Write a protein that binds this ligand. Structure first.
Ligand SMILES: [Mg+2]
Ligand SMILES: [Mg+2]
Ligand SMILES: [Mg+2]
Ligand SMILES: [Mg+2]
Ligand SMILES: [Mg+2]
Ligand SMILES: [Mg+2]
Ligand SMILES: [Mg+2]
Ligand SMILES: [Mg+2]
Ligand SMILES: [Mg+2]
Ligand SMILES: [Mg+2]
Ligand SMILES: [Mg+2]
Ligand SMILES: [Mg+2]
Ligand SMILES: [Mg+2]
Ligand SMILES: [Mg+2]
Ligand SMILES: [Mg+2]
Lengths: 136, 104, 177, 175
RNA sequence: ACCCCCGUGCCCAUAGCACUGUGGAACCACCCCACCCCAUGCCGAACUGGGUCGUGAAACACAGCAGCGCCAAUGAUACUCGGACCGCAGGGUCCCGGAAAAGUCGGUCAGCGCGGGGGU
């Protein structure tokens, strides 16, 4: 969720992601296919769904993180003073980027958990078990 | 002890335009001196005192300046740089100077 | 002199106790050091001359005023204020001070059982820390206004704590067995 | 295995979905290209510890370990491969999968085992005698224990290439 | 001509660090002494002035070595001038040249002058 950090506001455009195409932690991983912002409560709902389905057990990693501030001008004004101070934090997400990955849960239950979590994300997404991997 | 060497060596080869180098070495009882043409990677007129002996180092070195002044004099030496190593223009190397260019 | 009785009493004694090809390879003493540190919490300009006078009289050498490093902090830290008193002793005077300690700084002690034996540097060459000034040959409580405490680091070209340990033991330093 | 072309031009490669390839060592680092599906059946059968022979359409077999694959981020398919020609001195710093044996007694009271390092890069495996896996018995482990590299047993002529104290597999508590 | 030392440059990490070995009476170095030239905001530690011996201890010089740094390919990819397209949009594609970063293979513990000293 919200970071405790630095400059309030930013900008925006896109290109395919590089910083995490492969599933390092855990066994399985759901993975993004579209370039939307993800932001805060969207993730946290993914987290709370999977933690319901799995917890008492399993290991849940959230490799994505609401870095990027996004702004809302007030109410109903004209293009006025500056931008709007707050609103929500997002994480940009490009295809092949891994958002989620379970540990210690059978293949089928990871299927169902990824299905639930992905039914509330702006992007469609595909899951995979980790092929052979390199990058260490 | 180091930085003073490269310090005066940078201020010497900045002031070096036309004029030749004259690097007195003093750390031992070897007060060797050279006349180096910066640019060309060459020296031409060293006056080391491995064979000479005149007593106290301040006066032994004195003759070294005198020896050198004759050598460069045979080559047509205008003036020169001076290029002290680190030695604070003291009586032995100040004497090597007064002896070098009193007799130049 | 009092040194060469020290070196030959030890230099062969360590070259005999331990093999070294060179007399130069035997540990020596680079310098005595005294950090005074006066008024490090007491902001006493009247006492700056206090510690200056006590050090210059008891140490046969002039002291410098190690000024505050200028790491101003929440507490009374600031840049340019004086904060300590350094005095470096080399050669003859350092040997005279080491003799004043070995012959009057161990008699000076209260309740002696040695000095702390665990060598301070991992490289050796280490520093006594005075806990009280009352019993020095020069520091009389009657002539003095009040008691204070100083510091006395000493450097040795020992390559290990064990070697400077043997050297400072043979030289006349007491040890806490 | 088998492979044929190696032009600097790639327009032929994409159509028949054959992967691009290279083979190299000290003496010759020549590039090549090979069929895709057979390569994937092979790379399944053996990972970075497995090896296979390549028969370039020149008439001489060569023995190659697999060293790195770099493939599409969007499409999951592999794109490019780097086989490594290997002399029969010990192959350098090969990676070995970690695998766990037994039902840990930590699993039986609410814990679960977690392999903190899915691969361990050991030096001097010894070529042709390479460890294709690495079994670690976890049954002794209880909740909160760490089976470090100072535990993992090794076959012939092998020495761990990673710091022994580093955590490998660890049992973990509930939640 | 061969060897090594003292200076001194070009090049300044492929030439730097760490572990190790070898050098002393050629050379350099520590070292001895210091009231004075001279000097330390206190200390000859450093500058400094007079010299053996002793010792190569430390330093420095040279040699080994690839643990560390530093160099660093090929294959491919990213991106892209130009050309032509798709998607409502975020965004994507094709032909044509250009072409990284990183990482793998490997490469290195330099190379090149001037002088003077002393050896053979
Ligand atoms: Mg984009
Ligand atoms: Mg693009
Ligand atoms: Mg990366
Ligand atoms: Mg040299
Ligand atoms: Mg060494
Ligand atoms: Mg000889
Ligand atoms: Mg000395
Ligand atoms: Mg040595
Ligand atoms: Mg290429
Ligand atoms: Mg063009
Ligand atoms: Mg275009
Ligand atoms: Mg192109
Ligand atoms: Mg590169
Ligand atoms: Mg070397
Ligand atoms: Mg030469």
């Amino acid at each position: 969720k919200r970071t405790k950090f630095r400059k309030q506001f930013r900008g925006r455009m896109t290109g395919d992601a590089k910083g995490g195409d492969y599933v390092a932690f855990g066994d399985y991983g759901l993975i993004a296919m579209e370039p939307a912002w993800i932001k805060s409560n969207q993730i946290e709902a993914c987290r709370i769904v999977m933690s319901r389905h799995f917890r008492r057990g399993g290991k849940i990693y959230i490799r994505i993180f609401p870095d990027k501030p996004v702004t809302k001008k007030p109410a109903e004004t004209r293009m006025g003073k500056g931008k709007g101070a707050v609103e929500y934090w997002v994480s940009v997400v490009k295809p092949g980027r891994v958002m989620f990955e379970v540990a210690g849960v059978t293949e089928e239950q990871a299927k169902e958990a990824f299905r639930l979590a992905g039914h509330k994300l702006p992007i469609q997404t595909k899951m995979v078990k980790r092929e052979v991997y390199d990058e260490a | 002890r180091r930085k003073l060497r490269t310090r005066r060596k940078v201020r010497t080869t900045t002031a070096a335009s036309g004029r030749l180098r004259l690097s007195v070495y003093r750390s031992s009882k070897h007060i060797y001196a050279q006349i180096i043409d910066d640019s060309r990677g060459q020296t031409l007129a060293a006056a080391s005192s491995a064979a000479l002996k005149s007593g106290n180092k301040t006066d032994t070195a004195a003759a070294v300046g005198k020896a050198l002044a004759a050598a460069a004099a045979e080559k047509g030496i205008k003036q020169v740089v001076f290029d002290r190593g680190s030695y604070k223009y003291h009586g032995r190397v100040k004497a090597l100077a007064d002896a070098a260019r009193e007799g130049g | 002199q009092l040194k060469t009785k020290y070196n030959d009493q030890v230099r062969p004694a360590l070259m005999q106790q331990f093999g070294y090809s060179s007399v130069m390879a035997v540990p020596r003493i680079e310098k005595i050091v005294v950090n005074e540190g006066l008024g490090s919490s007491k902001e006493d300009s009247k006492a700056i001359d206090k510690a200056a006078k006590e050090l210059a009289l008891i140490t046969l050498q002039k002291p410098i005023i190690t000024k505050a490093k200028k790491s101003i902090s929440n507490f009374k830290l600031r840049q340019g204020m004086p904060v300590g008193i350094k005095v470096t002793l080399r050669g003859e005077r350092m040997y005279v001070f080491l003799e004043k300690l070995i012959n009057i700084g161990l008699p000076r002690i209260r309740d002696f059982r040695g000095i702390n034996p665990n060598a301070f540097d991992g490289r050796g060459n280490y520093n006594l820390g005075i806990k009280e000034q009352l019993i020095f040959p020069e520091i009389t409580y009657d002539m003095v206004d009040k008691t204070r405490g100083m510091d006395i680091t000493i450097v040795t070209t020992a390559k290990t704590d064990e070697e400077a340990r043997a050297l400072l033991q043979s030289m006349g330093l007491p040890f806490r067995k | 295995m088998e492979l044929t072309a190696k032009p600097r031009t790639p327009k032929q490669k994409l159509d028949e979905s054959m992967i691009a390839a290279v083979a190299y060592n000290k003496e010759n680092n020549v590039s090549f290209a090979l069929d895709r599906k057979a390569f994937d059946r092979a790379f399944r059968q053996q990972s970075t510890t497995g090896l296979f022979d390549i028969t370039v359409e020149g008439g001489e077999t060569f023995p190659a370990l697999v060293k790195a694959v770099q493939m599409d981020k969007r499409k999951r398919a592999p794109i490019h491969v780097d086989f490594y020609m290997v002399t029969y001195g010990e192959p350098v710093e090969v990676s070995v999968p970690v695998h766990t044996t037994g039902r840990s007694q930590g699993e039986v009271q609410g814990g679960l085992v977690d392999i903190v390092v899915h691969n361990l890069q050991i030096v001097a495996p010894g070529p042709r005698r390479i460890p294709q896996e690495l079994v670690v018995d976890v049954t002794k482990m209880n909740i909160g224990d760490h089976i470090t590299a100072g535990d993992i047993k090794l076959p012939e002529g092998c020495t761990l290439a990673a710091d022994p104290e580093l955590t490998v597999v660890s049992v973990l508590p509930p939640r």
